[PDB]
Design an enzyme around this catalytic site. Structure first.
Site, mmCIF file in Angstrom:
data_model
loop_
_atom_site.group_PDB
_atom_site.id
_atom_site.type_symbol
_atom_site.label_atom_id
_atom_site.label_comp_id
_atom_site.label_asym_id
_atom_site.label_seq_id
_atom_site.Cartn_x
_atom_site.Cartn_y
_atom_site.Cartn_z
ATOM 1 N N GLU A 1 -36.394 -15.259 12.533
ATOM 2 C CA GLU A 1 -37.318 -14.630 11.669
ATOM 3 C C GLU A 1 -38.709 -14.412 12.539
ATOM 4 O O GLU A 1 -39.498 -13.598 12.185
ATOM 5 C CB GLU A 1 -37.693 -15.114 10.449
ATOM 6 N N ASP B 1 -40.225 -5.927 7.087
ATOM 7 C CA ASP B 1 -38.842 -6.622 7.287
ATOM 8 C C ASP B 1 -37.859 -5.374 7.813
ATOM 9 O O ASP B 1 -38.269 -4.224 7.851
ATOM 10 C CB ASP B 1 -38.066 -7.304 6.501
#
Ligand SMILES: CSc1ccccc1Cl
EC number: 3.2.1.17
Length: 161
Positions: free
Chosen positions: A11, A20
């Site tokens: 991440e 994202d």
């Protein structure tokens, strides 16, 4: 290696609101804020999550705190889910990390993996790996999916080392 290190690799860490891979407002170590296109809505979610007026920016300590909460929420969701818990409990610790990783990324709803789960519970690792790759997940985030799948296939951290 542990679930925190694994997801931190997958991440990254960003202290200001970002988008994202699906285009959704996120912050920290992959903390989804909202699927709404409104940046103001994302900022409201952030302030609610942190407990102060953040203006879209957090500290590393705050990012790590949210991350711990998010990992715990993924684990507890698995343990409350009658489909996921038996499979999770059948796995060794390294493969359990791969399961948490998937739930962190896609949530419990992100459900269509019934056949993969059966193969994993049966410990048919190569077959499960083939089946897991036949997915929108693999096609849209192939390098991350390959790492998670290799973890399920081998029960080692080789993809992250
Ligand atoms: C789709 S990955 C997974 C999720 C929850 C429990 C067990 C596993 Cl293998």
């Amino acid at each position: 290696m542990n679930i925190f290190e694994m997801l931190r690799i997958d991440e990254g860490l960003r202290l200001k609101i970002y988008k994202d891979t699906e285009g959704y407002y996120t912050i920290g170590i992959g903390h989804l804020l909202t699927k709404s296109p409104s940046l103001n809505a994302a900022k409201s979610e952030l302030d609610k999550a942190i407990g102060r007026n953040c203006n879209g920016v957090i500290t590393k300590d705050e990012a790590e705190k949210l991350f711990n909460q998010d990992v715990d929420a993924a684990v507890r969701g698995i343990l409350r889910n009658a489909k996921l818990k038996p499979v999770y409990d059948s796995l060794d610790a390294v493969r359990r990390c791969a399961a948490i990783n998937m739930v962190f990324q896609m949530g419990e709803t992100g459900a269509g993996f019934t056949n993969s789960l059966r193969m994993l519970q049966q410990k048919r690792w190569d077959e499960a790996a083939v089946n897991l790759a036949k997915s929108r997940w693999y096609n849209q985030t192939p390098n991350r999916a390959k790492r998670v799948i290799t973890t399920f296939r081998t029960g080692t951290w080789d993809a992250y080392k």
